[PDB]
Amino acid sequence: SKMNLSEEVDLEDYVARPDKISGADINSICQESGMLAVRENRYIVLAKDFEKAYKTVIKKDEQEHEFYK
């Protein structure tokens, strides 16, 4: 709400993605979106930096050895 306009990004689809993320993670996703927008010097977020922020926050990197699963 306090964010800038998202130029019609699929926020509802981002919500629809099944991911075990807390409200803190959503706040982090938005915060990362703001940081990326500042870094590339554009005040209006779009799907590119929002998507990069989403991948960064919810990375959930495992690399786990295959024999476990």
């Binding site: 306090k2 964010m3 800038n4 807390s22 803190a24 993670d25 706040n27 982090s28 938005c30 915060q31 990362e32 979106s33 703001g34 940081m35 927008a37 500042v38 870094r39 005040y43 926050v57």
Partner: protein, 364 residues
Amino acid sequence: LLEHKEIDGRLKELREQLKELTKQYEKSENDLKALQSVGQIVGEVLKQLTEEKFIVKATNGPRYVVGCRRQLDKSKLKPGTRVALDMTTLTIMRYLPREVDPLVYNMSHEDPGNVSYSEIGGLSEQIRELREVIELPLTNPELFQRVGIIPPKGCLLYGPPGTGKTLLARAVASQLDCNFLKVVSSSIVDKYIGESARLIREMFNYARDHQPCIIFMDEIDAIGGRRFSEGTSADREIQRTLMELLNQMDGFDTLHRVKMIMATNRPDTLDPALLRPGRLDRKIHIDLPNEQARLDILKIHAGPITKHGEIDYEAIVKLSDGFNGADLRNVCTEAGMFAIRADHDFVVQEDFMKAVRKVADSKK
């Protein structure tokens, strides 16, 4: 010019040098106004009974209900504020900044050494990222306010020891020219049960009192550790400490202008609550240098050493794989040492070769 040789032959000495005893009179006047002082009792305000009557407890002594001086900002005399009392009339004489813990004092009054940003090398992406996350909220907060986000509260730098996370944070502090608490975790742990959490509380209380501030806690892997059940008394005590750190970062009381930097070699063992965003919004991989990063470290660390004729870096780079940053600075220092074994006032290329050879053997 009959009696005006330089100045009257006598005024040259009477005007200034025999007026040194006027500065001595000035010193005596300072002594006099120090004589007139009587010193003051110091205590902490406990409660505001009314607009004038304040409950004040003197340190290691009794408590009183006391008034305050006629001209004073009553609106700031909060409960717990260290204050000074007149010894005789026992009135609020003047305010005092909150007493600083001795370990907090020694941890905060260590000179960073004003290290510039040039002396890092090969960390461009990570140094830019950390510069953003820490200093951008400390330079143009209105940019963050407009964008629509709250400034991130801190980040993590994880990597092998010797990768210069401490150096990078130390450089950030020097650039910002702000208050800097450089603490090392596992040094705030104590045998006494409730002392480590108290030390964390005091650290963050100083940080809030001295905004803007950057708390660099190294080896957070020590205090921060996936809280687990069972555990010896110590295991639990450390959990309690981590719990304080957590609440002291993202807890009821919001942090402002106090940005934290945490360095560790084992990020995997960190607690998920600590690893959760809000507390540590970013995790930065300060990994082992690449060839470009390696040569950058060598070139920035070869500056002070005096070189004669020819000194190349790519050979040392391809022949010195695995060195993080401390090994390379060791190479440079050992080359400087090799320089005086054969008694030069300079260095040579073969000197650098044999230095990096010795450092590599020590690495093995």
